[PDB]
Amino acid sequence: MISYDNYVTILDEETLKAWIAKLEKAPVFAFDTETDSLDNISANLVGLSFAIEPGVAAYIPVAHDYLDAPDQISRERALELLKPLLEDEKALKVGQNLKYDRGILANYGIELRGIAFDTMLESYILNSVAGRHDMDSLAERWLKHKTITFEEIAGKGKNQLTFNQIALEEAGRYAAEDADVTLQLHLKMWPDLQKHKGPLNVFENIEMPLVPVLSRIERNGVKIDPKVLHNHSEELTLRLAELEKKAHEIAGEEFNLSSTKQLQTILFEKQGIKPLKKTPSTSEEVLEELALDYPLPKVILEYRGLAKLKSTYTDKLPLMINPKTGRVHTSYHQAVTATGRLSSTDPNLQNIPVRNEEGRRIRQAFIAPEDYVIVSADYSQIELRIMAHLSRDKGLLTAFAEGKDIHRATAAEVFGLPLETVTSEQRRSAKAINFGLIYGMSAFGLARQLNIPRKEAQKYMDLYFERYPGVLEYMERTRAQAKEQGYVETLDGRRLYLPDIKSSNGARRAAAERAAINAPMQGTAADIIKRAMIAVDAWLQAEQPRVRMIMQVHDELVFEVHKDDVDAVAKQIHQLMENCTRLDVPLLVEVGSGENWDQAH
Ligand SMILES: [Mg+2]
Ligand SMILES: [Zn+2]
Ligand SMILES: [Zn+2]
Ligand SMILES: [Zn+2]
CATH class of the missing domain: 3.30.420.10 (Ribonuclease H-like superfamily/Ribonuclease H)
Known part of the structure; x- marks a missing residue:
């Protein structure tokens, strides 16, 4: 004692x-x-x-x-x-x-x-x-x-x-x-x-x-407009009421918008195959398949998403405004993730929908004070560029080098056709493959995200490795040393220890093998992001410009910059982020600005 x-x-x-x-x-x-x-x-x-x-x-x-x-x-x-x-x-x-x-x-x-x-x-x-x-x-x-x-x-x-x-x-x-x-x-x-x-x-x-x-x-915190969030809330209450009506009207009678209770009894009773849709989720979402023809699963889907968003950000965010500064102060956690990326809570900025409109409206509430603009500096597909470097693949490396869309470049090689002609569906297939490699996903997993049959997905994956041999070799070499030394490293030396790398348990050792491939790319992105923050902060501290670094979310840094300084400041943030971190990975920073985070983003 x-x-x-x-x-x-x-x-x-x-x-x-x-x-x-x-x-x-x-x-x-x-x-x-x-x-x-x-x-x-x-x-x-x-x-x-x-x-x-x-x-x-x-x-x-x-x-x-x-x-x-x-x-x-x-x-x-x-x-x-x-x-x-x-x-x-x-x-x-x-x-x-x-x-x-x-x-x-x-x-x-x-x-x-x-x-x-x-x-x-x-x-x-x-x-x-x-x-x-x-x-x-x-x-x-x-x-x-x-x-x-x-x-x-x-x-x-x-x-x-x-x-x-x-x-x-x-x-x-x-x-x-x-x-x-x-x-x-x-x-x-x-x-x-x-x-x-x-x-x-x-x-x-x-x-x-x-x-x-x-x-x-x-x-520093971030300026959030509570009026905008409030109107968004009111409008979502009206929209949720309307959708409830649109659902009741597509079927008969009243019913909750909960699957495995009320939905299976309406949806499948009026035609549709028996298995319900679990909110597992991003692997076999029953409701969204139906959505391409069946209207009910579509309005129940759009309903839940809106309800979750309203209570998580529309109703919570205004309450987080600090009375002393009038701004929201998020909590960044430096020692929580396994790979080294910063996490964030109250609010968890990373959970704000990226590719969705309502997520866009949430972002519209993150505003710049008078005579300032929100500036967004983003590392374009940093994880993919890191994979290109890690796999020493001249194909990918060259695609990035000549500024081509790597997803279309990848599609043009995997499907064998000119880059100008690559279709939206081919681009979407190459993209699933690419981002699927980062998370070390299985050919079956790819199929579950591409909505195609197994072994057809396998076909796309075999064609990829043949064209991009360097990626298979990186993948095999990584799972190798993972079993040899019990851990994988990032370019800077950061380690992710993998205890289940030899687990014997199939599932756990499977997870440990995906972590092996993924950690070096994600951890490396994390290292680059931290080095950029340190570099941009040092300039801020030494030069004292009219700018505040207000957020870090995913691969982007968000600032408040004085409207009359945006050009010089943008040139500066840009040079610091892509030229004062690692000089080996081919990096590209997309800088954007606007009156709010949505506009700059
Ligand atoms: Mg203490
Ligand atoms: Zn103490
Ligand atoms: Zn990323
Ligand atoms: Zn540049």
Whole structure:
């Protein structure tokens, strides 16, 4: 158990100063902030904790204000004394999710520098799939130590305390332990992170430098027009009511729009083959086949999609506007995916329909403030370009080199015809093949997406490999080393460990083989995107132009740029993204602008 004896609670300047002096001479030191809220832009700093050595840590409370709280160094005095050390790039700091701490300090005009080690990221790079990368999971895995949980000192549910209400010593145990454990975790993981120059490279030049840029993107937020979202909601209520009527009218009587309950009884009872359509889904969607002739499955399909969208973005988004900035601040997660891509929540920007009109209308609500425009910089089919490079295929490489549509270029080789004549159906077939290779899909899987018979899909796949021999060879070589070393790598050295690569279980080992082929392309896209963000952010920080980097979704970066600066800025973002990342993969950035994200997109 952690008691009051482990860590000191600093309540006087003299003692703070003695610690600042010891911290100034330490090789590295763990740093942590405690606040009254998870909301970064509006959280107030309640205290800070440091650890100079395993077992030697302190908690400096500055804003506890429960009834009769003892005197504390004031927040303003603690920060002015600590400011030099925090802003010194030479004073190296260790922390768990330093993105959060860097932001809190920024609420006071302090720029945390020397952001050298983040234990969450040390863990993530060592093995993205070892388990959760939070401090409690980390402490238990690497230190065989169970940490004090927030719920343990603050309580649970609606009656949970905020940090400023927690007694000094209790807050101390929690805060000082965070700092202590964090430093111990670093001492155990940092040495390990050196056994391989690959992960070390990614951790050092991709992950760590991205910490403060994600903080800045999150705190910048994105301007959302709540009126637009509201009208969209009202209109969707009318449209859903109308569709319900259109459905009732195509059949007889009233009924819910739920399959395997009410639909099979109408749809198949009035002709159609018995199997219902599961919402599995993107492999055999019964309702959408019927859609090409049968009107009911079409209106039930268009209905559900609209209902899901309205409650997920139309009704939720306006509620996410922060009263302090008037903007929405999404949460980017740097250590969650297996491949290295950034994930996103509240809102999950990646789930906003891309090829659909309603998704387009959601995007129309992401607007630019007055005298600014939304600028969208996208990496055109980066994953496919990466595959071209990874497979050393002169065919694909040349298609990209001469600016041809790779899907039509691919179709012209797989079907053997001039590029000008390739039909829409041939392009759609080559496209399914191409993007099917990225996710390592089976000839049968391809057939399930192309609506053709098995072995016909196999026919398209055999013709592809004959024409693009380099891709089969990459695919075979990748599944090979995956079984040899138990993991696959990206161009920068990032690793995806594959434990089920020899699973024996057919399904699991199947998944592990698809992950083997996919991770190097997806992880490499992720690495390039992070390097671009770091590069664009560095220019932003050095030059201070009239631009804010507001989002990262899929392979695009979204900005707010001043209307009178769009041309120069666009030229700049463009050169940075395709010329300041990897020089080996043939990259292309499509830059676009408009009054809203939909227009720029
Ligand atoms: Mg913390
Ligand atoms: Zn803490
Ligand atoms: Zn992509
Ligand atoms: Zn260019």
